[PDB]
Design an enzyme around this catalytic site. Structure first.
Site, PDB file in Angstrom:
ATOM      1  N   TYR A   1      -5.272   9.354  -7.073  1.00 53.81           N
ATOM      2  CA  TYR A   1      -6.415   8.335  -6.722  1.00 53.81           C
ATOM      3  C   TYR A   1      -7.860   9.126  -7.036  1.00 53.81           C
ATOM      4  O   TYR A   1      -7.853  10.235  -6.444  1.00 53.81           O
ATOM      5  CB  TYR A   1      -6.405   7.463  -5.720  1.00 53.81           C
ATOM      6  CG  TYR A   1      -6.684   8.095  -4.582  1.00 53.81           C
ATOM      7  CD1 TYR A   1      -5.736   8.869  -3.652  1.00 53.81           C
ATOM      8  CD2 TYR A   1      -8.158   8.287  -3.971  1.00 53.81           C
ATOM      9  CE1 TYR A   1      -6.241   9.458  -2.417  1.00 53.81           C
ATOM     10  CE2 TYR A   1      -8.498   8.656  -2.737  1.00 53.81           C
ATOM     11  CZ  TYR A   1      -7.484   9.323  -2.246  1.00 53.81           C
ATOM     12  OH  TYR A   1      -7.798   9.966  -0.790  1.00 53.81           O
TER      13      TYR A   1
ATOM     14  N   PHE B   1     -17.438   9.723  -2.697  1.00 56.37           N
ATOM     15  CA  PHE B   1     -16.326   9.924  -3.465  1.00 56.37           C
ATOM     16  C   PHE B   1     -15.144  10.843  -3.005  1.00 56.37           C
ATOM     17  O   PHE B   1     -15.353  11.930  -2.530  1.00 56.37           O
ATOM     18  CB  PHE B   1     -16.910  10.654  -4.789  1.00 56.37           C
ATOM     19  CG  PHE B   1     -18.106  10.133  -5.324  1.00 56.37           C
ATOM     20  CD1 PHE B   1     -19.299  10.313  -4.493  1.00 56.37           C
ATOM     21  CD2 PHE B   1     -18.292   9.207  -6.360  1.00 56.37           C
ATOM     22  CE1 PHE B   1     -20.709   9.736  -4.968  1.00 56.37           C
ATOM     23  CE2 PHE B   1     -19.428   8.702  -6.743  1.00 56.37           C
ATOM     24  CZ  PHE B   1     -20.486   8.971  -6.069  1.00 56.37           C
ATOM     25  N   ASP B   2     -13.914  10.333  -3.038  1.00 54.27           N
ATOM     26  CA  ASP B   2     -12.955  11.028  -2.622  1.00 54.27           C
ATOM     27  C   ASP B   2     -11.502  11.123  -3.401  1.00 54.27           C
ATOM     28  O   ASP B   2     -11.655  10.142  -4.495  1.00 54.27           O
ATOM     29  CB  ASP B   2     -12.149  10.394  -1.534  1.00 54.27           C
ATOM     30  CG  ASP B   2     -11.074  10.803  -0.936  1.00 54.27           C
ATOM     31  OD1 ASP B   2     -10.989  12.156  -0.714  1.00 54.27           O
ATOM     32  OD2 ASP B   2     -10.095  10.082  -0.555  1.00 54.27           O
TER      33      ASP B   2
ATOM     34  N   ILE C   1      -5.090   0.472   3.449  1.00 52.38           N
ATOM     35  CA  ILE C   1      -5.960  -0.667   3.361  1.00 52.38           C
ATOM     36  C   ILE C   1      -4.936  -1.877   2.611  1.00 52.38           C
ATOM     37  O   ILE C   1      -4.362  -1.446   1.653  1.00 52.38           O
ATOM     38  CB  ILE C   1      -7.232  -0.580   2.881  1.00 52.38           C
ATOM     39  CG1 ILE C   1      -7.365   0.191   1.249  1.00 52.38           C
ATOM     40  CG2 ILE C   1      -8.099   0.108   3.757  1.00 52.38           C
ATOM     41  CD1 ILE C   1      -8.774   0.043   0.828  1.00 52.38           C
TER      42      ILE C   1
ATOM     43  N   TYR D   1     -12.193  -2.234   4.987  1.00 58.02           N
ATOM     44  CA  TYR D   1     -12.500  -1.659   6.195  1.00 58.02           C
ATOM     45  C   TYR D   1     -13.625  -2.985   7.008  1.00 58.02           C
ATOM     46  O   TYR D   1     -13.998  -2.531   8.017  1.00 58.02           O
ATOM     47  CB  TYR D   1     -13.209  -0.240   6.404  1.00 58.02           C
ATOM     48  CG  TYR D   1     -12.550   0.435   5.696  1.00 58.02           C
ATOM     49  CD1 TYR D   1     -11.369   1.206   6.473  1.00 58.02           C
ATOM     50  CD2 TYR D   1     -12.400   1.198   4.487  1.00 58.02           C
ATOM     51  CE1 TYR D   1     -10.384   2.207   6.099  1.00 58.02           C
ATOM     52  CE2 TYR D   1     -11.402   2.068   3.901  1.00 58.02           C
ATOM     53  CZ  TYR D   1     -10.507   2.740   4.752  1.00 58.02           C
ATOM     54  OH  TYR D   1      -9.825   3.446   4.372  1.00 58.02           O
TER      55      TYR D   1
ATOM     56  N   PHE E   1     -11.476   2.080  -6.884  1.00 52.79           N
ATOM     57  CA  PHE E   1     -10.616   3.231  -7.018  1.00 52.79           C
ATOM     58  C   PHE E   1      -9.853   3.148  -8.111  1.00 52.79           C
ATOM     59  O   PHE E   1      -9.600   2.167  -8.841  1.00 52.79           O
ATOM     60  CB  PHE E   1      -9.360   2.745  -6.021  1.00 52.79           C
ATOM     61  CG  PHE E   1      -9.513   3.191  -4.629  1.00 52.79           C
ATOM     62  CD1 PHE E   1      -9.953   2.097  -3.781  1.00 52.79           C
ATOM     63  CD2 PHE E   1      -9.385   4.397  -4.030  1.00 52.79           C
ATOM     64  CE1 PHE E   1     -10.147   2.279  -2.460  1.00 52.79           C
ATOM     65  CE2 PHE E   1      -9.562   4.386  -2.538  1.00 52.79           C
ATOM     66  CZ  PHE E   1      -9.981   3.535  -1.821  1.00 52.79           C
TER      67      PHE E   1
END
Ligand SMILES: COc1cc2cc(OC)c1OCCCOC/C=C/COC(=O)[C@@H]1CCCCN1C(=O)[C@H]2C1CCCCC1
Length: 128
Positions: A45, A55-56, A75, A101, A118
């Site tokens: 992802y 950003f991840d 989540i 969250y 995402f």
């Protein structure tokens, strides 16, 4: 771009139909079988806050992200969203705080009342 397109003609995949999780398929997967609750699931992802500040990516490490579907390791939006995906699918999801969250957030990484975006690639899933 990508988030905006998801808002626009974005498929609402919540049960309550509250637009809390919207989806587009960007690259189509194979096989009829989506994952059932409990399946061990392997994804890549990219994620970000809509505020544009974080950003991840699974690539930021050198491994797939692995998790058990429906077993609250992610989540609610992920459990709902990845249950709709086929092997080899890439999808985009746009997510309201309620399915992520919430009001508490997850400070300092995730603010209060955040919307998230995402891109997910569903690599594989096995039973357990
Ligand atoms: C809320 O905490 C985080 C959230 C995400 C990534 C994190 O670390 C890389 C992260 O830091 C703590 C280590 C948590 O690792 C276990 C799981 C966290 C829960 O994460 C999630 O449910 C979703 C979906 C699966 C990938 C991670 N993820 C996240 O919300 C990400 C964030 C990171 C910030 C931009 C938006 C995506």
């Amino acid at each position: 771009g990508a988030p905006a397109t998801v808002t626009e003609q974005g498929e609402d995949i919540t049960s309550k139909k509250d637009r809390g999780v919207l989806k587009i398929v960007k690259r189509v997967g194979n096989g009829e079988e989506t994952p059932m609750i409990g399946d061990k699931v392997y994804v890549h992802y990219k994620g970000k806050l809509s505020n544009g500040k974080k950003f991840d990516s699974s690539h930021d490490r050198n491994e797939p992200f692995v998790f058990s579907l429906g077993k609250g390791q992610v989540i609610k939006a992920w459990d709902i969203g990845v249950a709709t995906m086929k092997k080899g699918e890439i999808a985009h999801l746009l997510i309201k705080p309620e399915y992520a969250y919430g009001s508490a957030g997850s400070l300092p990484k995730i603010p209060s009342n955040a919307t998230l975006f995402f891109e997910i690639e569903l690599l594989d899933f096995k039973g357990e």
